[PDB]
Each structure stands twice: as C-alpha cells, then as structure tokens.
Amino acid sequence: GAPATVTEQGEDITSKKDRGVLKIVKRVGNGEETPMIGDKVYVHYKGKLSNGKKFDSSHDRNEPFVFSLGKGQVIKAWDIGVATMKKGEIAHLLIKPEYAYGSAGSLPKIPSNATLFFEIELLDFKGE
Numbered sequence: 241g242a243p244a245t246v247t248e249q250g251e252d253i254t255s256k257k258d259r260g261v262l263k264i265v266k267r268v269g270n271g272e273e274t275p276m277i278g279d280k281v282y283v284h285y286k287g288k289l290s291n292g293k294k295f296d297s298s299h300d301r302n303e304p305f306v307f308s309l310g311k312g313q314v315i316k317a318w319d320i321g322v323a324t325m326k327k328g329e330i331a332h333l334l335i336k337p338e339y340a341y342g343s344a345g346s347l348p349k350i351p352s353n354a355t356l357f358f359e360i361e362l363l364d365f366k367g368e
C-alpha cells in the first residue's frame with residue numbers, strides 16, 4: 241500500500257537527510273508559489289498510523305483543515321512537508337516519530353514511537 245510505496249520511492253525532504261519525512265507528489269498543483277512560514281494554509285487530508293490501526297479525515301469534520309504554517313499548530317512534518325507543496329497538489333507523506341509525536345506519543349490517539357501516513361491536498365494559502 242501507500243505507506244510502503246512511500247518508503248521505497250519517497251523523496252527525503254528533511255534538512256538532516258534522516259528520512260524522517262518522505263514525500264511523493266501524487267497530483268501536480270499550479271503556480272510555483274509554495275507556502276511561506278506564517279501563511280494561513282487550507283488543506284484536506286486523510287491520515288492514519290502506519291500500522292493501519294487508527295484512521296482520520298478532514299472529511300469527518302465536513303470542512304477543510306486550516307492552520308498557520310510554522311506556528312507550532314501541527315506536527316513538525318506538516319510544517320516541513322506542506323511548505324514544499326503547490327496550490328492544488330496532492331502529496332503522500334510518511335513520517336518518523338521524531339517529526340510527529342516522538343517517544344511520548346499522544347494517547348489515546350497516538351502511541352509512543354509511531355510512524356504516521358498522510359495524504360494531503362493543498363487547497364489554498366494566504367499571507368498573514
């Protein structure tokens with residue numbers, strides 16, 4: 241499935257090159273602006289534990305997920321990965337614990353040392 245494909249074929253978009261955040265572009269977006277730190281960002285996403293064992297969707301809330309990039313609202317891997325996307329792009333991210341919830345986890349949703357998978361569509365972004 242998608243998580244294994246990203247392991248095998250994803251690009252390492254970390255500064256450290258530690259394969260902490262692996263990305264595949266699944267649908268190409270438009271323009272060549274990508275969101276800058278501070279931007280108000282609008283996405284739809286489907287996410288789960290690597291393990292397949294918990295699953296989560298923006299669609300569950302019936303509404304886009306909105307956050308300021310690099311403002312510690314989301315895990316480090318989102319600040320990193322969404323910043324590489326173009327408006328209208330869909331990407332797959334596979335994320336090691338260090339770029340997500342770490343060895344502490346976030347119970348009961350997220351266990352210790354959890355690898356996470358997301359599909360993200362970038363809908364839009366606007367300057368602060």
Ligand SMILES: COc1cc2cc(OC)c1OCCCOC[C@@H](C)OC(=O)[C@@H]1CCCCN1C(=O)[C@H]2C1CCCCC1
Pocket residue numbers: 285287288289294295296305313314315318346349350356
């Ligand atoms: C750890 O708590 C949650 C994690 C997720 C969804 C949650 O609710 C819909 C959630 O609890 C409510 C807090 C809202 O704040 C989410 C923020 C921390 O989340 C994140 O940084 C990331 C990226 C933005 C989308 C939500 N992300 C999650 O980690 C989800 C996970 C995804 C894997 C399956 C379990 C939920």
